């Protein structure tokens, strides 16, 4: 158990974080580091094209064998 | 607006149906036409008409 429900204590610093606005709390240079480094795998996943712009095309010749 | 202006940018862009720049088959065609066609069967006849020919005397 009954003394341990006494939650309570994870909710309040739960609060104090989430009421949080100015980026991701604590920042730490690393973020970004780390961001940019999984930001760099999707680019070598998706390819290197600006994915906020609709793609361009230039079609290939069919082909004959 | 950038899934607006993909929906319409995906529609209403018209791809490229390629060029059929490729039968010049129907030429080489016709070339063997004048080849295998005509020349070989109108031989073909003539040697067709003599041996009928051929067997018109030996009826007699």
């Known amino acids: 158990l009954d003394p341990v429900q006494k939650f309570v204590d994870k909710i309040r610093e ?6 949080t606005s100015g980026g991701p709390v604590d920042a730490g240079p690393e973020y ?6 999984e ?17 361009n095309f230039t079609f290939e010749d069919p082909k004959f064998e | 607006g950038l899934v607006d202006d993909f929906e319409k940018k995906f529609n209403a862009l018209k791809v490229p149906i390629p060029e059929d720049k490729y039968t010049a088959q129907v030429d080489a065609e016709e070339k063997e ?6 020349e070989f069967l109108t031989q073909s006849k003539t040697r067709i ?12």
């Open chain 1, 14 to 19: 739960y609060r104090t974080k989430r009421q």
């Open chain 1, 39 to 55: 930001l760099f795998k999707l680019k070598q996943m998706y390819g290197k094209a600006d994915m906020n712009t609709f793609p």
């Open chain 1, 32 to 37: 970004q580091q780390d961001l940019d480094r």
């Open chain 2, 33 to 38: 036409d004048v080849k295998s066609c005509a």
């Open chain 2, 49 to 60: 008409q003599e041996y009928e020919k051929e067997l018109e005397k030996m009826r007699n």
